[PDB]
Design a protein around this ligand. Structure first.
Ligand code: ZN
Ligand code: ZN
Ligand code: ZN
Ligand code: ZN
Ligand code: ZN
Ligand code: ZN
Ligand code: ZN
Ligand code: ZN
Ligand code: ZN
Lengths: 212, 213
């Protein structure tokens, strides 16, 4: 036949002809959105390289961004082990959620359950991006704030911690010391990034582009 | 009624009483696995802090790791905008897939369209972890610019110190942010070569940072 049809024949579609499709940020890992896909949606994602879904309510194919202009440009596609779940790994043109939120996932359940009569949405973030968010909040006196207001102290720390990290290899120190000094390097380097208005995602795009 | 019951009433369950549940590594962002959850599965994930699902084929609740011991320890739970999709954000005790793979997502589709008769599974990786994997592959092979650094500690440490100073210069000398991003990428790359020599994973570094807050 052809290769795409042969692969699509191997997907474990449900009894409506659908699989779960998850869009994920190729540079950061943030989950952008989750929908469903039929044969045509997956084939169209592959051929067009734009994340394409099937709407159960509209009984219709749709492409993220067809109205909003915020397309997800797809770098790769992965099936899970039993072939009923698909990741579209790609780079968003702009906020993925129709609400304007950066991703569709900003409703924290654990926060809802704490004893406090007040609600607040917040994007789901993994550890590296949570640190970036905390530093950005401090920028807008904690020790992070102290480092944001004393350039010379910060740069002295960045050079000092880089040297300490090197010394874990030069003096054959335990790998736990290496991980701890790398954490120190990363933290102070990210305070500098905040001062320069650079996002971690932008740094990771640079690394991707160099190894392209 | 209590807070969990009130929350579960606000989930947009499908006509089998299910929502999609996605387990995601809290430290790295890797998607570990995706299944379905009913009311009881979400309530049990919240109360036990272990990722819990409903099996459509077995019509039964199950907790990831109940046999394999590779539990996913849940740090937070998120709903999507229209409340029919759930992220279990958590830390796995070990590989999530029953096959032994670290995650359930190792079947790349674009490979099957190449020209050689060959197949090769590989974990889905985002940019930072893809670079980590490339360096590890260079370390494993025998007789390349990355390979040069893996085989010369003194050149490598020289570069790390040099690059850290370059990054500082972008602030001290008020350079454009494009320069700062480029120098941070230099710092990251060379540091990650040292991590490879020390057998340290990026995930272990990010765990350290999370634990400090
Ligand atoms: Zn399986
Ligand atoms: Zn599956
Ligand atoms: Zn949304
Ligand atoms: Zn020292
Ligand atoms: Zn240190
Ligand atoms: Zn919505
Ligand atoms: Zn949804
Ligand atoms: Zn699996
Ligand atoms: Zn440089």
């Amino acid at each position: 036949s052809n290769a795409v049809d042969s692969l699509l024949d191997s997907v474990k579609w449900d009894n409506k002809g659908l699989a779960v499709a998850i869009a994920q940020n190729v540079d950061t890992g943030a989950i952008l959105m989750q929908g469903f896909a039929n044969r045509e949606a997956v084939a169209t994602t592959i051929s067009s390289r734009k994340a394409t879904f099937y709407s159960r309510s509209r009984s219709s194919l749709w492409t993220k961004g067809e109205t909003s202009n915020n397309f997800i440009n797809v770098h790769d596609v992965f099936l899970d082990c039993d072939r009923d779940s698909i990741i579209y790994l790609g780079k968003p043109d702009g906020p993925t959620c129709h609400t304007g939120a950066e991703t569709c996932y900003y409703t924290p359940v654990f926060d809802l359950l704490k004893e406090e009569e007040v609600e607040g949405n917040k994007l789901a973030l993994t550890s590296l991006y949570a640190l970036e968010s905390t530093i950005s909040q401090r920028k807008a006196p904690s020790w992070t704030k102290r480092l944001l207001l004393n350039d010379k102290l910060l740069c002295s720390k960045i050079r000092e911690e880089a040297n300490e990290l090197c010394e874990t290899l030069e003096n054959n120190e335990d790998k736990s010391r290496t991980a701890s000094e790398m954490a120190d390097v990363l933290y102070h380097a990210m305070v500098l990034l905040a001062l320069k208005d650079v996002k971690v995602e932008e740094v990771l795009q640079v690394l991707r582009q160099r190894f392209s």
